[PDB]
Amino acid sequence: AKKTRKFGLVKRTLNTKKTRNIPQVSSALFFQYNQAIKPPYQVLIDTNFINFSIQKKVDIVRGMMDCLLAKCNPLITDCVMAELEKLGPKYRIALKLARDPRIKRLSCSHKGTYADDCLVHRVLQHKCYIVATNDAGLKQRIRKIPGIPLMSVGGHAYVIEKLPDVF
Amino acid sequence: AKRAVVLGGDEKKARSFIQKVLTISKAKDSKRKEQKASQRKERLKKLAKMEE
């Protein structure tokens, strides 16, 4: 393994040389269309989205109704629920909004609290929801996956990104 | 060298027809791999034009 022997070997080399798994495309996916998103909508909420909605003082369900021009159904999982519960006292009013009979709790079977992994598993397994967030790396992840409606918070209200039915 | 065995009739037609089929498939496989390599080199030129 001497270096000059390696030198001779690379010169000889240059002189001589000179069960799998494929996840299916979803049946509800025309080329980038995602025709399966019709009213009523089914949306998925993030802690960042909650706290920034408090900051911009917008109403949650009224805000998504006026932004999306129809009826919409809100969902949070146990990962983001435990994430709010971990944030705790300063966001106790955020917990008070997150506990509501109008928001429908969705269960999960996960080990840890990585709501990023939880939600990205959800969207990689379903492709029927609308994600509502503010986070940058997760935003880039849901951007690099195609055919899915991102809605972020910013400015005076919410903003939709990928839904073709903007109006 | 090959083994020298005499064959009569039907088996000679079997080997002749099956070597016809082998040469057909050899030509078709060579055509598939040349078309595939041409697609690779054009894809590589377009990847270069898009990276730079």
């Binding site: 000889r12 002189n15 | 060298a1 020298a4």
Partner: peptide, 28 residues
């Protein structure tokens, strides 16, 4: 091949250093 011919190194020991017309074909 010319380079390997120059550096043959003639002291290598490898263990593998110890190993009618149709009528004639039918015979053989």
């Amino acid at each position: 091949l010319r380079e390997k011919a120059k550096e043959r190194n003639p002291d290598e020991y490898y263990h593998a250093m110890h190993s009618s017309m149709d009528q004639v074909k039918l015979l053989k």
